[PDB]
Symmetry: C2
Subunit: 145 residues, 2 copies
């Protein structure tokens, strides 16, 4: 036994317009926008929001995701969900995605990628099958280095 | 009178599954998440389990709240049905220091709350929710620790 997770890294929220949601989060909730990224290839725009201007070690953030094209994964997810914004998935932070992927694998855990893939920042990520998540899609994510 | 953060952190993410014990077994067995509290309320027909990634919680550490129907008349059973028997993220709860004040502020900005007055939650927390149209596609909970 041992802890394979530091904390929930972020909760991904999918919506048709990331800008609109971020401005709502800021204007209405007073949340803080910490980072914005656009990935033409994935056809996804992502924005990181937090309840404070400065993150604390285990502070979980909210990730706003919106499509850049109707071919993107996010667009088809939104289509299959009343085209309405909704919680998309949970990402849990790991100190060593390889090491932890070994442990998870050893415990019969099924991942999505054979190998971790690069994501936001230099993050090395991977997921879990929506079934392996009892209905919920769960992402594994390790900060760079 | 500079505006101050209304939220401390995301208190917990609610996951609605048909079997809490089951889901809880999974988080501990497989994922190795620690179970910190289990509660059962007949009134509402719900069973809840608080899971954390560590044994001890850090000030701003978010937990996963496993919800599960105790019968088919529970609000949670319906939801599960609504989401086609598919378990899944149910809601997000944000911790606040003073729910009455945060609620008053939120209303001035046009937010709609489910209850006019805070309800009593688990552990003595005072809670309320921000109408889906307010949370924007998501049901957001406000949670104040009893103090």
């Amino acid at each position: 036994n041992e802890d394979l997770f530091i904390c929930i890294d972020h909760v991904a929220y999918a919506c048709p317009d990331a800008d609109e949601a971020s401005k709502y989060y800021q204007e209405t909730f007073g949340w803080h926008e910490l980072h914005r990224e656009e990935n033409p290839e994935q056809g996804v725009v992502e924005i990181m929001m937090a309840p404070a201007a400065k993150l604390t070690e285990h502070m979980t953030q909210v990730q706003v995701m919106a499509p850049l094209n109707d071919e993107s994964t996010v667009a088809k997810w939104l289509a299959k969900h009343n085209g309405r914004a909704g919680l998309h998935h949970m990402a849990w932070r790991v100190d060593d995605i390889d090491a932890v992927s070994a442990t998870l694998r050893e415990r019969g855990v099924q991942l999505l990628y054979d190998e971790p893939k690069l994501g936001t920042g230099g993050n090395r990520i991977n997921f879990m099958h929506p079934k392996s998540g009892k209905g919920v899609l769960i992402e594994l994510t390790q900060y760079p280095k």
